[PDB]
Design a binder for these strands. Sequence first.
RNA 1: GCUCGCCGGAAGACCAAGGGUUCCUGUCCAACGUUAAUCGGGGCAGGGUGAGUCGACCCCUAAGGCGAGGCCGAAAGGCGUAGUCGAUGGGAAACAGGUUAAUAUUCCUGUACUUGGUGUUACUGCGAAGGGGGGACGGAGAAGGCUAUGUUGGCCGGGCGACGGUUGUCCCGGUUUAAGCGUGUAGGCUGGUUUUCCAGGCAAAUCCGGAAAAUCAAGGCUGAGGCGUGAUGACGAGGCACUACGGUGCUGAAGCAACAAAUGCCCUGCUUCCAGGAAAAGCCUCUAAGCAUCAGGUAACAUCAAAUCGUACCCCAAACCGACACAGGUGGUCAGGUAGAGAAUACCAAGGCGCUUGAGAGAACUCGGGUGAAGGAACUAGGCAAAAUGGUGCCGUAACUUCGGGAGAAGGCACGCUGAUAUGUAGGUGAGGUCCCUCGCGGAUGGAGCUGAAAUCAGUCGAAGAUACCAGCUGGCUGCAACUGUUUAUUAAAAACACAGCACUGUGCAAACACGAAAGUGGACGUAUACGGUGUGACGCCUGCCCGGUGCCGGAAGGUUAAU
RNA 2: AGGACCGAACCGACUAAUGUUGAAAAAUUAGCGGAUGACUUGUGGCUGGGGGUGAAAGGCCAAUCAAACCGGGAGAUAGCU
Lengths: 271, 93, 46
Amino acid sequence: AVVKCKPTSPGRRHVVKVVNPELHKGKPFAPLLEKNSKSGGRNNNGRITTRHIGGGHKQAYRIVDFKRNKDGIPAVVERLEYDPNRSANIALVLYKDGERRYILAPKGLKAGDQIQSGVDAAIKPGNTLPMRNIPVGSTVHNVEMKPGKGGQLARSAGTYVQIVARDGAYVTLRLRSGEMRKVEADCRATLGEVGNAEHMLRVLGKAGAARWRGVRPTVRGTAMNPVDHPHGGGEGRNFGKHPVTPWGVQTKGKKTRSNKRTDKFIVRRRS
Amino acid sequence: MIREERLLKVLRAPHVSEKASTAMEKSNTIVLKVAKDATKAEIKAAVQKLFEVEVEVVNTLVVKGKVKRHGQRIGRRSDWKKAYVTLKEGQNL
Amino acid sequence: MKRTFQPSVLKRNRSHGFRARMATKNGRQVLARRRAKGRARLTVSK
RNA sequence: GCUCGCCGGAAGACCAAGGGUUCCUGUCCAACGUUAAUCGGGGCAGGGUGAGUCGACCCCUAAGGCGAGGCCGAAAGGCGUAGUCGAUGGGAAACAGGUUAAUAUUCCUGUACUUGGUGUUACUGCGAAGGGGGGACGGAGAAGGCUAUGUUGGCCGGGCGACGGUUGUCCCGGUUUAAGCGUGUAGGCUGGUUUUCCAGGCAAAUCCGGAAAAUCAAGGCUGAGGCGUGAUGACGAGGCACUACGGUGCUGAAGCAACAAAUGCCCUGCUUCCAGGAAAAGCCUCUAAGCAUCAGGUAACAUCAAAUCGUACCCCAAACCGACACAGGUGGUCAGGUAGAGAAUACCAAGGCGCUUGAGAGAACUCGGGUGAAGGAACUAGGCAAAAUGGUGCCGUAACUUCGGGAGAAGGCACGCUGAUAUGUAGGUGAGGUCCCUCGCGGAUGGAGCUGAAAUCAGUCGAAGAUACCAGCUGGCUGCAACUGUUUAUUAAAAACACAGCACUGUGCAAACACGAAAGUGGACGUAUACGGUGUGACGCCUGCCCGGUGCCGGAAGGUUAAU
RNA sequence: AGGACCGAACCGACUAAUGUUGAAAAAUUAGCGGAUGACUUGUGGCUGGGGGUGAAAGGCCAAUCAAACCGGGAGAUAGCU
Ligand SMILES: [Mg+2]
Ligand SMILES: [Mg+2]
Ligand SMILES: [Mg+2]
Ligand SMILES: [Mg+2]
Ligand SMILES: [Mg+2]
Ligand SMILES: [Mg+2]
Ligand SMILES: [Mg+2]
Ligand SMILES: [Mg+2]
Ligand SMILES: [Mg+2]
Ligand SMILES: [Mg+2]
Ligand SMILES: [Mg+2]
Ligand SMILES: [Mg+2]
Ligand SMILES: [Mg+2]
Ligand SMILES: [Mg+2]
Ligand SMILES: [Mg+2]
Ligand SMILES: [Mg+2]
Ligand SMILES: [Mg+2]
Ligand SMILES: [Mg+2]
Ligand SMILES: [Mg+2]
Ligand SMILES: [Mg+2]
Ligand SMILES: [Mg+2]
Ligand SMILES: [Mg+2]
Ligand SMILES: [Mg+2]
Ligand SMILES: [Mg+2]
Ligand SMILES: [Mg+2]
Ligand SMILES: [Mg+2]
Ligand SMILES: [Mg+2]
Ligand SMILES: [Mg+2]
Ligand SMILES: [Mg+2]
Ligand SMILES: [Mg+2]
Ligand SMILES: [Mg+2]
Ligand SMILES: [Mg+2]
Ligand SMILES: [Mg+2]
Ligand SMILES: [Mg+2]
Ligand SMILES: [Mg+2]
Ligand SMILES: [Mg+2]
Ligand SMILES: [Mg+2]
Ligand SMILES: [Mg+2]
Ligand SMILES: [Mg+2]
Ligand SMILES: [Mg+2]
Ligand SMILES: [Mg+2]
Ligand SMILES: [Mg+2]
Ligand SMILES: [Mg+2]
Ligand SMILES: [Mg+2]
Ligand SMILES: [Mg+2]
Ligand SMILES: [Mg+2]
Ligand SMILES: [Mg+2]
């Protein structure tokens, strides 16, 4: 549920938070956790290569099953959990043979529901199979771009993909970006939408909240001196530049896609 | 713990002082300078063979040599090892 | 107030120590020059 | 030596870092010491640092470093696999007392504990670089039980007071005791046992996980403190001997209870939230290669071993960083009495100090303070600086408002002491006794003793009872920025930056973007409800017209147009 | 519950006086702001000079940063003094 906070303090007035009582309280399933090393957005030269990353809460990594290829063995959802590493929630599923895994929690899915993967699984939310066996028209998420490689498309909370055509060895997908894209039909996909669509209704309400999430301040170019940014200084507020990146490239409007190698899978670009 | 060539080189000298005299009267303990690289075991064996008395326990410390200036230049005395070697109650020498 | 030299032997030795000079071509050149100059102390040591 | 004064959440004590003999003793005084110096952190000499269980080393890993081969790069080199290092984190074990001029959880006395080797003996499936468990984890908050500690009483020793009183409801002091061992408490968690079966745990498993029957209701795990023991002891005012007057020896009373009580412990708990909270080994268990009367495992007793380095002294400072014996800087630990909400503040205790030129004088002027007639902002750029306000409880409190606020708005009243209610009350705590008991560190009953705010009534002293220290000044109009935050270390803290929110715009994942001749990497173990760049800047009511210029996006016909 | 309120430690640095051959190459005294957080702090690590880092002041990068420090080209050049 999304909940507004009362204004018992100015940093609370605008907070709107997503609170989901279906989610496990306390700790994750230890066997599926790894260490998660924060970067500050610096690379193996110690240089900041992506700005504005730093601080924010410590996080363990949950091992999520994006491939969903434990075929034929049914499994049941034990509980949904919070995953700090992503906007979607995850399900702890138990397989008939004693194995446990994490999957992306699709909308509607809950403790008790039964999932299954393989060339013959039932068409139902939470089930996974090659798209050559999902009816054209359906709605899917966690879609593979190469067979058996693992889900890469439509994983973020609330997202989904629609299979709009299948022909030859390929399906055509309407991605959430609006793009029409071809992917080969032996690629796997999971029936449903990703859960937690109410994610986008949160309002952080204060600066501290973005900090908890590891977002450091963005400094406007126009607020700098010429030596630092093409957006220069001035004398009082001054602009008169064509707007650019810090590196002198045209922000606003310049396409930066450049991949002849994959051009051929793109049926229609996003508008 | 021993080979006689090494044992003969391990004890260097009696150390004399009020603390060392008292350690003998009061505790049947003799105080020695021993080789720097000497170990408690060597010291114990050495004392036992050469001075021919039975040893209870050996304690050891390393003394830092004092520095002395000399106008613009310093000199430094040598570190050495001190051994508190306690003899068994039936006192000897 | 608080001054620029705040000691740490561990950090002294890691930045400037003999082994650190020896680890790179240019640090080994620091030692070469110092030995050619005939310095008594090549690095701060024990 | 006797007094006086200062600190006492420190100006005491103890660690780390850093220093490195500055420590103790003798001796000396030129230079050092802002003065003299017989003294010194100064000169010279000698002495002094004692460990299985305190730390390091050691085993284990974090960020990160290094890296056989390897990938990459004119050379130099960059990156990286297996590995190997790296604590600021995880991993065995010791306490109280005594002692030196100077060390002590290290020596001594007493009393313990840990992990290995070897033997003996009884029993036995042993085996890892592997599996599984465990180690192993956040923030906030609640409050019950405790201890540290204190207070009073009792107990024991001593006292009878320099000046009125002081044999009593009087004065002073002491009333301390560890680890370990036994007991398994307040309390926390969790159902337990058997059997059978299985697509998981890289093979294997008797272990974990999953499935199915059977059966019992109580089982197990964790756990402060208390009590006992340790202790036949140690410590203990004082006494009696001696003393070179610094000391040393011998001896040694009481050593209890009630009440209060942490921020320490139970608590790695419990409750709750979102921002969702290291790793690896030690440890427990499972098997594989294997080994099978061996080996190995478990136990009791015995026996051996536990090396090496550190250990002095300063440590919020005269010994470290500051050129100085420098109003500076420097991480952690401990927390006594009275008042007090308190770790604020004042006065004290233990402990430490009077800050290394002093003696006089009592001019101007400067610095830092106290008091001030009448006036009361007339000062000045400006109330700058001063002066003022200042506690608790209750009564009461406007516009405006996003309904939280504004608000401690404003303003008012009470406030010490003594007695009565009640020789100490409401409450808190809780003994004897009685009774039950699955008998205990148990339950009920019982209310003794102890402790104890607050109110009302009456009385009473002073000019003044929040008496000191301590401790808001209040209100009205208006510019700017929503707000908490950030910033020019050293003339600017602001209206500047950030900010949640909004928009534009790029980006289909080998993403765009960024560091890199490259390899590799960040973005991200993310995937369009995501990531980057740009502008605007909570919220409310809103955001109109202009595409000629410049910038960008799209276009293919025509013209022009490169190497070739 | 809260980037909530008052207020020590702790973090900061709004005003004034003093000091300015200082006690101090940035302090001291009286007042001041934050004080459960976008807090504060120890140990160790990473980023390197047209480079870093910057809630952006051209701030900071070992007591002078619109291009650090050291050594070298080096006796740069100096129609100036
Ligand atoms: Mg500017
Ligand atoms: Mg341009
Ligand atoms: Mg030693
Ligand atoms: Mg000396
Ligand atoms: Mg001395
Ligand atoms: Mg003199
Ligand atoms: Mg001296
Ligand atoms: Mg010993
Ligand atoms: Mg490397
Ligand atoms: Mg090589
Ligand atoms: Mg290692
Ligand atoms: Mg460590
Ligand atoms: Mg001492
Ligand atoms: Mg044996
Ligand atoms: Mg393991
Ligand atoms: Mg918790
Ligand atoms: Mg007590
Ligand atoms: Mg009298
Ligand atoms: Mg219980
Ligand atoms: Mg005595
Ligand atoms: Mg000491
Ligand atoms: Mg100290
Ligand atoms: Mg401090
Ligand atoms: Mg002085
Ligand atoms: Mg000082
Ligand atoms: Mg105080
Ligand atoms: Mg007057
Ligand atoms: Mg008057
Ligand atoms: Mg008036
Ligand atoms: Mg006027
Ligand atoms: Mg005037
Ligand atoms: Mg004023
Ligand atoms: Mg005043
Ligand atoms: Mg009255
Ligand atoms: Mg105006
Ligand atoms: Mg503001
Ligand atoms: Mg400034
Ligand atoms: Mg200022
Ligand atoms: Mg703006
Ligand atoms: Mg407009
Ligand atoms: Mg065009
Ligand atoms: Mg606050
Ligand atoms: Mg101040
Ligand atoms: Mg405050
Ligand atoms: Mg650092
Ligand atoms: Mg030249
Ligand atoms: Mg010249």
